[PDB]
Point group: C2
């Protein structure tokens, strides 16, 4: 993953979310768009992007009850190694990959 910071365009990526829990659900995997956000401590899936039957627990933010597998997809369709998280769920303008995820991908902010 390598994305140039641009004022006018948000650093958006496509992500594959996979519910890995035992609880039965309509769709095990979904595709979403999420912002690479260096200012967020943790990852948050918007209420709009979160599957209705995917259970949440009172962490305003709720937290995924189940462990989610997160697959970041590069602009050319190449895949980063997946991460296992328990994302937050909230009413935010869009899904956000926080520093828990940025760290897991081994990202750095640089001009070198």
């Amino acid at each position: 993953l390598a994305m140039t910071m641009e004022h006018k365009d948000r650093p958006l990526v496509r992500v594959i979310l996979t519910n890995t829990g035992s609880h039965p659900v309509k769709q095990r995997s979904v595709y979403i768009t999420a912002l690479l956000d260096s200012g967020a401590d943790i990852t948050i899936i918007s209420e709009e992007d979160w599957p209705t039957d995917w259970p949440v627990m009172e962490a305003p933010m709720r937290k995924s009850r189940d462990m989610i597998e997160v697959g970041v997809i590069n602009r050319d369709g190449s895949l980063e190694r997946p991460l296992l998280l328990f994302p937050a769920v909230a009413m935010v303008r869009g899904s956000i990959l926080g520093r828990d995820c940025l760290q897991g991908l081994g990202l750095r902010l640089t001009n070198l």
Copy 2:
């Protein structure tokens, strides 16, 4: 600038702000600390960091004077200054948005 993304550390930098207007001010340049926020479209200075005689125009407000922004690295080296009209708001920490990020030529990368 090179900063590893870590869950436990907020990517904070020291910044020098300089008011470039005509009118007198008590302090023309101040030191603050701010967060590098790729999720922020615009740079925002907390009201707590913003000098009181530095005018704003009409929740956020925009600086009336053009402000020079110089990021200072941990080791004290200076990055190239940028000219902007930052927003001022009731946040609890100043934020450097992508307006500054792009000016700095930054990239998010594992390569």
